[PDB]
């Protein structure tokens, strides 16, 4: 019911004319107990640049606690990873502002919880191997009658001011330069033999928050059980038996622009496709180009493309043959889902998969490795040391874009306007295409 002006759910519409329906059963309840029937009822990491990692002296900065939840503030070694979460190893030396404890390979109580609108403060001795915090001007104490919170560490490559946030929290960190906004420095600090980060700098210290979008990386020796074995046709083996092996999206490095095919070998649920140079879709599912024609009047408006992430599913030798355009073979069967549309795009060889068995995937009418490098007679195929077997990993940190835009906003017509052009300095790796400044 057409042109209905109330086409919204329960969450927003006028329930006061529905309060005649609400209070109808608020007074009809009095006909029940008068009768005798009653009723009874993600986590982001924030850190400074590794080149500021001071390895000597007595240092201090503060944190303002604004809202409720995850407030973890501390100092960590430069090898701390934002792929994981804070504290759960020997690297991070942090204090839990909520739940009244401190994180270094575990949990043990320290101090209290924050308040809304706080200033925490954290102080680190680097010459001496102690580390004493504070809170709102008050030094924080342990259960064992000690303000000397973190002791007996190892002085390696210094310690960077780190942090962590949760789901709906707002944070405020001050690395010096703002002595007028030092709310508890005058009682603790200079009178305790310490220093802020205001001691020398003339620049604004760059922050390295973690990155939401997963973009892939080299396959290291860093997994419990992931080991591509480079073998000499000229496959790439595997093994992935662990306790947590849900989904890893694999891909090779080098793409094909716009004649040869490409073979896998699997026993069983396991996909085979092609990745275009933007694939940062992490999902344990199946999901996603589709733009039409335009012929100055319409009248055809059919399609452009098919590719946007190509789909397949004793030996499953499912094969992505290329050019021309794209098709698929499967153990000899030229199956359906011809993805034969690509104008001038670059396509990564790709495998998206789970892990059930070890020694499970492989790789490679002649064969393939001509079409990448510059020499292209190259009918004998040959593997190369530049061929890597990347794994899509989650969170590698980003820079902070120290000056942004001098925009202004209006309402009477909503004028939004900037007039100060800033510029990058962007370099893009040509063969693993992505733009870094």
């Amino acid at each position: 019911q057409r042109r209905n002006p109330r086409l919204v759910p329960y969450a927003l519409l006028d329930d006061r004319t529905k309060k005649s329906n609400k209070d109808s059963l608020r007074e009809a309840v009095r006909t029940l107990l008068g009768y005798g029937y009653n009723l009874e009822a993600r986590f982001r990491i924030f850190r400074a640049e590794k080149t500021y990692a001071v390895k000597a002296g007595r240092w201090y900065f503060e944190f303002e606690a604004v809202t409720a939840g995850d407030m973890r503030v501390g100092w960590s070694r430069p090898g701390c990873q934002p792929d994981q979460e804070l504290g759960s190893d020997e690297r991070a030396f942090a204090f839990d502002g909520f739940k009244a404890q401190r994180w270094h390979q575990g949990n043990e109580h320290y101090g209290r919880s924050w308040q809304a609108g706080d200033v925490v403060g954290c102080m680190v001795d680097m010459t001496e191997h102690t580390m004493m915090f504070t809170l709102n001007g008050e030094i924080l104490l342990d259960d064992s009658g000690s303000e000397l919170a973190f002791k007996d560490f190892d002085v390696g490559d210094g310690f960077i001011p780190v942090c962590s946030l949760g789901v709906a929290q707002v944070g405020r960190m001050n690395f010096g330069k703002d002595v007028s906004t030092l709310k508890y420095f005058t009682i603790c600090g200079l009178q305790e033999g310490y220093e802020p980060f205001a001691v020398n700098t003339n620049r604004d210290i760059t922050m390295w928050l973690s990155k939401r979008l997963p973009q892939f990386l080299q396959v290291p020796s860093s997994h419990e059980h992931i080991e591509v074995t480079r073998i000499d046709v000229t496959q790439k083996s595997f093994g992935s038996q662990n306790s947590s092996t849900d989904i890893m999206f694999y891909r090779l490095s080098m793409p094909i622009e716009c004649t040869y095919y490409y073979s896998v070998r699997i026993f069983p649920n396991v996909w085979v496709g092609w990745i275009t140079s933007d694939f940062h879709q992490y999902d344990t599912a199946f999901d996603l180009v589709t733009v039409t024609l335009g012929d100055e009047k319409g009248k055809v408006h059919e399609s452009i493309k098919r590719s946007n992430y190509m789909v397949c599913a004793n030996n499953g030798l499912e094969i992505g043959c290329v050019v021309g355009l794209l098709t698929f073979t499967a153990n000899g069967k030229d199956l359906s889902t011809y993805y034969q549309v690509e104008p001038s795009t670059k396509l990564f060889p790709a495998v998206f998969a789970q892990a059930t068995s070890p020694n499970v995937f492989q790789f490679e009418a002649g064969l393939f490795k001509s079409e990448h490098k510059n020499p292209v007679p190259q009918c004998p195929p040959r593997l190369h040391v530049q061929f890597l077997s990347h794994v899509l990993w989650s969170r590698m940190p980003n820079q902070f874009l120290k000056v942004d835009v001098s925009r202004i906003s209006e309402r009477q017509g909503w004028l939004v306007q900037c007039l100060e052009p800033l510029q990058f300095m962007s370099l893009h790796i040509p063969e693993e295409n992505r733009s870094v400044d």
């Binding site: 303002e64 709906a168 405020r172 909503w414 040509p430």
Partner: protein
């Protein structure tokens, strides 16, 4: 020295080729969309070149479950239409973008994005279509059958000395075609505030504020209490208290003075429903005889225990 320059240089493929580009920022008017909707823009500044490169200004929609908005430094050059979660348009020589690939649609003017232009974009509700127009003239709107997930909202991006005006209400010129303006998705309680398109910055000299990720359309989920069957002891007990519940629909209507009539006309004092609960059928008192049944099953099935204790009447 000539020989390295002939071989290693001009391939642009072994080395790390570089450039510099302009910073891109995107803004959205805090709207969401979980018939066909319609928003406008009037671009009031041109600046084709205030750099040693061209300037850009793109208009269009987006999604929300995917592509955290990282400015320039993430995917290629940042902005609008550069990912799969972005469907954008608009240029001098108005060729559009989707997933950082430019396609070359036409219109028989090939205008700029001047000081005196209006875009005319649209988006279909419950249909996967987006069609643009320049000054009303059709640009042969394009985007058909992309993803329907998350929520759709206009995220116009810009990198120039350019000012624009959201014609969103304070409407000045817009055709109406189809049926929806975006002044109606801001109807009940939400206001018209414009942000920096998911805002991971708070550009302050002292301390940028920090943030957590996110926490998240007229087809909700109701509650269902049909398949919890009443016992026939509490079934009459409910209809004993419903015998003294339909009289409450007389009790709030014996003050209103719309007495009995064999026809049903409430606005001229005709009302065939003054007789009580069990005596009238489920025809005209169906709004007050079937009403008491399922709405009292869940009175003792949503945990609210009312055992068979005292006398319902």
């Amino acid at each position: 020295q000539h020989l390295i320059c002939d071989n290693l240089l001009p391939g642009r493929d072994l080395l790390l080729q570089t450039r510099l580009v302009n910073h891109v920022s995107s803004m959205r008017p805090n709207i969401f969309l979980g018939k066909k909707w319609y928003y406008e823009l009037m671009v009031d500044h041109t600046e084709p070149f205030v750099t040693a490169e061209a300037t850009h200004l793109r208009v269009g929609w987006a999604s929300t479950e995917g592509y955290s908005p990282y400015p320039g430094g993430g995917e290629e050059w940042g902005g609008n239409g550069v990912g799969d979660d972005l469907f954008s348009y608009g240029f001098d020589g108005l060729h559009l973008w989707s997933g950082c690939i430019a396609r070359t649609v036409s219109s028989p003017n090939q205008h700029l994005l001047r000081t005196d232009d209006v875009i005319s974009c649209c988006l279909d509700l419950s249909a996967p279509s987006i069609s643009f127009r320049i000054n009303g003239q059709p640009v042969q709107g394009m985007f058909e059958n992309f993803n329907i997930d998350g929520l759709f909202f206009p995220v116009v991006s810009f990198s120039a000395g350019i000012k624009v005006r959201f014609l969103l209400g304070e409407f000045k010129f817009l055709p109406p075609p189809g049926y929806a303006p975006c002044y109606e998705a801001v109807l009940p309680k939400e206001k018209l505030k414009v942000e920096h398109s998911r805002e991971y910055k708070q550009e302050r000299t002292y301390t940028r504020d920090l943030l957590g990720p996110t926490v998240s359309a007229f087809t909700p989920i109701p509650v269902d209490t049909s398949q919890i069957v009443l016992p026939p002891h509490l079934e009459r007990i409910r209809e004993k208290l419903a015998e003294n519940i339909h009289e409450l629909w007389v009790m709030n209507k014996i003050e209103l003075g719309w007495q009995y009539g064999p026809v049903r006309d409430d606005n001229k004092r005709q009302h065939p429903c003054l007789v009580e609960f069990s005596k009238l059928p489920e025809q005209e008192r169906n709004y007050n005889l079937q009403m008491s049944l399922e709405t009292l099953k869940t009175l003792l099935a949503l945990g609210c225990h009312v055992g068979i204790s005292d006398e319902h009447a």
